[PDB]
Amino acid sequence: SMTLYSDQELAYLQQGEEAMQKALGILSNQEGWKKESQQDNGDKVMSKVVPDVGKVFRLEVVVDQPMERLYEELVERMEAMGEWNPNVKEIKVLQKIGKDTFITHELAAENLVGPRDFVSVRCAKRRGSTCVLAGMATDFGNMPEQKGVIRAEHGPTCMVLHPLAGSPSKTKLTWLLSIDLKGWLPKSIINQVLSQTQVDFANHLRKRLE
């Protein structure tokens, strides 16, 4: 039947789709990206200075594993993704709204870069054959910043799972990343870290799959 939503919810709901459309729009704009890395596995990391946001990172990786498996392992079981991933210490779902959107507190581990956590809303939609994780830093007053860890913010961040052009057994994972670490960190160093952060996620992801 019909369900009703508090204005605060609808707020998060909007954000859940504002983050999605804007991140997809950054992928729709195909050509224009520079290149940051090129792996032995054919893994790629593109970059671009978006007017609205700023310098973003686009991870180009394909995996020799079923798509739906990556789904449950990446979202349905994301709370425990802190196990097979060193770059993250603890991820906790603060609240689920409706079917797609939900707010999370992602606490990532640091040794020259100070520890940083995140409180963001994220939408897990799928047009059937293609699943996609959206998200962006949200304001969850019911979980303010704690002493010790610095609250960094996420820009329009998406992640697309697409069955291989000619192989259902394979999946093309496209991960557009946008973050504002919000430290005093130099401009240069921020680039390489966010890049390797992506290349690492790809590695650990493949390893978990086994």
Author numbering: 64 to 173, 177 to 276
Task: Provide text from the study.
Group 1 contains the name-giving family member, steroidogenic acute regulatory protein (StAR/STARD1), and STARD3. Both are cholesterol carriers, and mutations in STARD1 cause congenital lipoid adrenal hyperplasia. In the StAR group there is a similar ion pair between the β–strands, namely, Glu169 and Arg188, which is not found in other family members that bind cholesterol. Arg188 has been suggested to bind to the hydroxyl group of cholesterol and it is also present in PCTP and RhoGAP groups. All structures reported are relevant to disease. They are down- (STARD13) or up-regulated (STARD5) in cancers, mutations in them result in metabolic disorders (STARD1) or they are linked to obesity (STARD14;).
Steroidogenic acute regulatory (StAR) protein related lipid transfer (START) domains are small globular modules that form a cavity where lipids and lipid hormones bind. The ∼210 residue globular START module is a curved β-sheet gripped by two α-helices. The concave face of the β-sheet and the C-terminal α-helix enclose a hydrophobic cavity that can accommodate lipid molecules. Here we present crystal structures of four human START domains, those of STARD1, STARD5, STARD13 and STARD14/ACOT11.
